[PDB]
Symmetry: D2
């Protein structure tokens, strides 16, 4: 449910995200080394591929990839509670289960441009917790991919630094517009409305110092995504599009770090991709077991708590 990209000097680029949902999302982290053979779980005409890039990802119920980054610095965030209208699936085109959407992207491409160029070819038939896809890279580039009237719609440009789960993206830009005229040190909208979150993220992302110091940038980036999270247990059924923030992620594109934080358990740590073996030859599929509401606590660089496990099967046909 909320995402933004910060761009500092000397390629110090960072993508942060909050997950908002009404319930436990059953998230564990996974490491997938390169050269994995995969199917889109969309019946006999599922798309197939062999991963080119290793990733570290956050699962949706250990049956989907909902967040993550790859060793090339591409980040993917699948946002929940979106206004989608997905296409019908005949069965005759190559199909891709939406649960694997993010994984396909993370496995196959190094940049947002690479990904967008291929996405505009015709092999994006999604199958089908409603979902849209946000992407960012180490160069600071961004894109969002939506389904509106059964059609894939892509916005692509580094100026799209902030994205929310509701409403559609051309609408999000509209709701933000009023606040481009009002200075963010004088007034900001402070509710948990997606528009309000959007505006605060946009203001704070651009106000972060751009000077090279990763510890500082990280500090400022968390503090901002925390600001834009939805407090827990507070929202009422009167506002269906808002949900409590369950967890947060921060992706350090330069240094290849994936930070994770729980709202339900005091639990914050990160995975360092530079110490992972993502090779075909010896790299293992590994899982970090967080447990329900991330009760299993880790801290610092948590790589050593990763355990060899068989990769889960994506949800599909």
């Amino acid at each position: 449910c909320t995402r933004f990209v910060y761009i500092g000097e000397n390629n110090q680029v960072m993508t942060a995200r909050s997950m908002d949902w009404k319930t436990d999302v059953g998230t564990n982290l996974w490491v997938f080394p390169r050269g994995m053979e995969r199917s889109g779980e969309a019946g006999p005409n599922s798309v197939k591929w062999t991963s080119k890039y290793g990733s570290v990802i956050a699962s949706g119920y250990d049956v989907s990839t909902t967040d993550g980054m790859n060793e090339a610095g591409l980040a993917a965030n699948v946002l929940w509670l979106v206004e989608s209208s997905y296409p019908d699936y005949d069965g005759k085109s190559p199909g891709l289960s939406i649960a694997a959407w993010a994984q396909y992207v993370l496995d196959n491409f190094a940049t947002v441009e690479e990904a967008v160029r291929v996405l505009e070819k015709n092999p994006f038939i999604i199958v089908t917790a409603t979902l849209h896809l946000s992407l960012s890279d180490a160069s600071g580039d961004s894109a969002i991919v939506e389904y509106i009237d059964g059609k894939q719609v892509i916005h692509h440009g580094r100026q799209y630094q902030v994205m929310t789960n509701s409403p559609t993206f051309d609408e999000q830009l509209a709701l933000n517009a009023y606040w481009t005229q009002i200075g963010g040190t004088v007034m900001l909208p402070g509710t948990n409305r997606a528009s309000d979150r959007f505006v605060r993220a946009s203001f704070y992302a651009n106000a972060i110092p751009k000077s090279e110091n990763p510890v500082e940038a990280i500090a400022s980036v968390f503090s901002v995504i925390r600001n834009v999270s939805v407090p827990y247990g507070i929202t009422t059924p009167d506002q269906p599009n808002i949900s409590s923030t369950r967890w947060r992620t921060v992706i350090d594109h330069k240094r290849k770090l994936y930070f994770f934080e729980s709202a339900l358990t005091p639990n914050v740590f990160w995975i360092d991709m530079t110490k992972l073996d993502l090779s075909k030859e010896t790299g293992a599929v590994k899982k970090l077991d967080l447990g329900a509401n991330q009760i299993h606590i880790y801290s610092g660089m948590a790589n050593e708590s990763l355990k060899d496990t068989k990769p889960f099967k994506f949800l599909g046909l």
Copy 2:
């Protein structure tokens, strides 16, 4: 710089606080068992006392107590950047260095009433960042103690659930007033102005579910104090009363837990007072060394990382 008390059912009371300051505050945690003999470090007429309650506290530069709780469930939060006018100190009356103010309170009293009743009768003159004192109890009671026109001024009542560092507390209630007419699901002020923070804290504190489940309450309480923290590195010298949030505390009054979180390092853990030896007979002074910007990471119940250390000397003379 921002503090609020949440009151749930069955004595599930929680006090949360953010520390806002322009720089490192050099904070480490300390455990002080009962029966410690102390001096107020205010020259020959320093007040003296022997602690009646063990505490766990957060230091200011290992030369002051700026935050903490005691085994009876009294909490003390010393807020920074306040509008004070402290009295002059003739050497003649019993004196108390302000660096030990919070400690004196935590050491001597079990409740906010107990503390207010004694402070009313003027047992000392405070001696002298600028600082004011916020207190809360396991019964949900609250008070704030300020110095205005060289005089100790106390507000005392459970209805005073939210306090900021600026301006004076009477003024804080005034700046909040406008927003009592506007529903918090429709609009909230979203900047880092103390008034804005105040208003969001009051709305969210009362919107938290009151149902008995500590893990849920804790989750909702952090998420709210995080919401009212000031994002890191963002504020400019144009607005002198606002400062980046350096860390947060959450005090669980019922279960006697002290949670601590850093903004500069991913570092979150808690101290469980029920597993500490706070006896005069066999209770040691212990310190948890967090290091500059809390670089030393802990997690979960961090009691075992506490180390026997000689207690620091409070600042003043």
Copy 3:
């Protein structure tokens, strides 16, 4: 319902007011020269007095004085829909019907200080639209007189430039407080809530140029009181304290001009007190007949349309 004072250089002082009410107020203008003998219409112990200062006033139903000024430059605005608690009237003390309250003040005093000094010592008991009294003078001084818990309460000072007929005056200052921190060119509250009106009036009053040019000042002052009026026919029963603006008044203290404008009829004009005969020796009581909803249109200096009439009898027995 909305009043403000602008203070320019060289004693260019102006008081503006909007009248908000749910229905026709039946207002006509009257001229009362000096030396009129009057009774307070409060039974056998009614206060009695002989006017010292000629006035031009706006009636409430030709049975009360609800607005006006005197030849010395004292202005009185009786605001409607207030939170009053009026005293009981035994019958033993000198009494004054509230319908004549403003008239008594305008007739007897030249300044706000003069008036406050005499009203402090309680020369009468008010006898009972719910009503409170606002005053201003050619020196820029202001006061408001309210009844709270059956007691006369007076606020007196030049700094009280803005008053509403919403909540008690002490509460008005509180609701305004938040907006003293926010620059009025960046954000202002735009609804018809008394607090919102108050805040816009306080900002615009202090932003008007202070350079001596009456035509310009007048233009600015109307434009501001128009801003702060409540649009006609718009308010819903959900907000009982707000009412459509029926008319506006602007008092030029220096030049002794009383401007009047209708919201229900396009009708705007003024009375010039310097061309009226207010002497006891030859001055007549005169009325300008505006009619229901001010259907009788005048323009410019409307003095010539004033007609000799017997003064009305104030309500109350």
Copy 4:
């Protein structure tokens, strides 16, 4: 600078407008009967036409038509300080001086649809205060015509009830968007920013009662256009797109009344088109001389103060 259309029952349609500018606009009112032969004052290839419909209009500096209505109920409001990029004028195509733009429209068409169908096919090139054109009808229809990237751009639909001078119209709808989520009785933006004015006008226009009672509707409509006017003398050079409101018009489409009000002089009146002779055979060109800052005061139906005058020459070459 601000315009809106109110639509009541039984064809009770009204267009109101504020004119905002930094200085005197030198406006007088004119009556032009039908059958006037006119040139576009754009050199040898000026467009020519013979008026079909009599109009009453407000001039720019007696050299342009900036506001008005015709006997069929078409209204035209030329807004000032717009973001235009006008086309180059060769000299080869039929040309129309922008000063006569509104007049051409009022003279030739009875409805907004009639006007849009002809303007779509480009009968002329506008020849060139920056100006854009707003139109409304007795049927409640609206359109706005702008020049963006040297191209005529038209928005046409009854939904476009509110228009400002800034920014371009597509951008105006965007800046309004945020406030479609917030109820106008709970919060409205209260500054003089065009967006703020836009939002308040859209809310109040739709909240006006739709009853058939012209005096009431008129009252509400003025009160609203007064609300969205920019107070006089208070804007600073820091905000270049905002200007003091100089005057207002209200057009009663059903009854064919043109109301005019000054901000600089207390002066309000109207022209009744049903009592004008607009025939070619006996109708005279007439002018109502308002004078600098509308110092010449009129009131009520001011028709009798109209004086036979030679029509002015539109600016051009």
